[PDB]
Design a protein around this nucleic acid. Structure first.
Ligand SMILES: Nc1nc2c(ncn2[C@H]2C[C@H](O)[C@@H](COP(=O)(O)NP(=O)(O)OP(=O)(O)O)O2)c(=O)[nH]1
Ligand SMILES: [Mg+2]
Ligand SMILES: [Mg+2]
Length: 425
DNA sequence: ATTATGACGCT
């Protein structure tokens, strides 16, 4: 009892820009605001693959990974913005820069771990302590939490329910106890309302957030009430929340490992994991997964919020599916040169903005009819930011995959250059 | 013929 630690030491938030690329296009083109609209890559094949969808279009069934021509069947009024194309490929510069805007605002409040182009984790522990001392026992008003949902409440119209749950929670709060985890979460949620208001004031972008004691619960919480809302998942809400939560919904159990948990153990929901000893879990799933699962199904996770606002690698990738697969030497060279030219542009801007140089170049390729998503992956040294040198070295490092007797076989369905191993500059 | 990425683990 007294010695079972409960993983209530930290306050952690996950902030996700809602349908981010769509919002970027809607800020730039006001004729898209508050309409069903989606963002697409390419236009020739079935109107393009959709990678971002507004909530209005979602109301009609439009999803990511869907062809635009199919989305139009579900939503005939759908508006489409095209990703920029440079050197024959998609170019996401507009959104990486919009993302830097957002991250830079978030960093004013706390240390943030860039988790993706549009979402970060926040370690609010110190900020909550500072703010708690600032209040000096003063009670927390519902006015400070105008968009917060308390998961599990009310107990015993959507905004009406929300306010009821918030009132029940705030009435129960022990404000005089500067060490109660629930109070600390509440204060973190006040600070996240402030962060979200600053992001929207200074960018016009709206976002959702989850507030809890760890990254996995913050991420799960973030998803309970979207869009433009935030959800506080308290330690005490976990047993009910997890009692019907499909295992696949927890970050990192969405794939094969979550499938084998389901199949081997014979369960469906996260909470059912509590009925297995740690050793049993370790035995089925390895020592790391086992320890991690034994703690996670009790709402405990220790992965730290890593202080990292910049990506660790910088990458350029283009698929060549179907009959478009590259089949000659000239083709592989020209696309390696296109890939390297964009890579070089991104790298020079990275060196100048962020004072660092990449030292290693990873070349990945897929070949046609190869099952795997990397038919090959080989590294070479990255010594200068020269597109022609980088493309030439990538070719030198893959060329012994050609089996022709000027021709290229097996045909290539993917080229991919990645710059890694950054050293300060 | 979702694509374009990017973190992270295993060996
Ligand atoms: N090129 C590409 N971009 C992608 C892909 N997946 C996502 N993006 C881009 C487009 C997305 O806008 C952005 C962020 O991805 P999310 O946070 O997963 N989705 P969003 O912010 O759209 O909606 P929500 O309110 O549910 O969070 O990343 C992809 O497979 N390929
Ligand atoms: Mg998002
Ligand atoms: Mg995201």
């Amino acid at each position: 009892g007294p010695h079972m630690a409960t993983g209530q030491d930290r306050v952690v938030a996950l902030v996700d820009m809602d349908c981010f690329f769509v919002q970027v296009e809607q800020r730039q083109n006001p004729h898209l605001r508050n309409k069903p609209c989606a963002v697409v890559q390419y236009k020739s094949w079935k109107g393009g693959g959709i990678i971002a969808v507004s909530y209005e279009a979602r109301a009609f069934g439009v999803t990511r990974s869907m062809w635009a021509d199919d989305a139009k069947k579900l939503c005939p009024d759908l508006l489409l913005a095209q990703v920029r194309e440079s050197r024959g490929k998609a170019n996401l510069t507009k959104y990486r820069e919009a993302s830097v805007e957002v991250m830079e605002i978030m960093s004013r409040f706390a240390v943030i771990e860039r988790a993706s182009i549009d979402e970060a984790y926040v370690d609010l522990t110190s900020a909550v302590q500072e703010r708690l001392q600032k209040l000096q026992g003063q009670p927390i008003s519902a006015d400070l939490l105008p968009s917060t949902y308390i998961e599990g409440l009310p107990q015993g119209q959507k905004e009406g329910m929300r306010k009821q749950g918030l009132f029940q929670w705030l009435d129960s709060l022990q404000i005089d106890n500067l060490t109660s985890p629930d109070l600390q979460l509440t204060v973190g949620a006040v600070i996240v309302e402030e962060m979200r208001a600053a992001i929207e004031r200074e960018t016009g972008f709206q976002c959702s957030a989850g507030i809890s004691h760890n990254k996995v619960l913050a991420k799960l919480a973030c998803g309970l009430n979207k869009p433009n809302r935030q959800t506080l998942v308290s330690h005490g809400s976990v047993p009910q929340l997890f009692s019907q939560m499909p295992i696949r919904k927890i970050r990192s159990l969405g794939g094969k490992l979550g499938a084998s948990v389901i199949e081997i153990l014979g369960i469906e929901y996260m909470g059912e994991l509590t009925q297995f000893t740690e050793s049993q879990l370790q035995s089925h799933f390895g020592e790391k997964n086992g320890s991690w699962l034994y703690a996670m199904c009790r709402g405990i996770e220790h992965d730290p919020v890593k202080p990292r606002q910049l990506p660790k690698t910088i990458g350029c990738s283009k698929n060549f599916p179907g009959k478009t697969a590259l089949a000659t030497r000239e083709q592989v060279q020209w696309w390696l040169l296109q890939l390297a030219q964009e890579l070089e542009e991104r790298l020079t801007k990275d060196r100048n903005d962020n004072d660092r140089v990449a030292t290693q170049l990873v070349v990945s390729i897929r070949v046609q009819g190869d099952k795997r998503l990397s038919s090959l992956r080989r590294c070479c040294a990255l010594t200068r930011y020269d597109a022609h040198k980088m493309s030439h070295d990538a070719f030198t490092v893959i060329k012994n995959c050609n089996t022709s007797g000027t021709e290229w076989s097996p045909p290539l369905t993917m080229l991919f250059l990645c710059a890694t191993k950054f050293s300060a500059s």
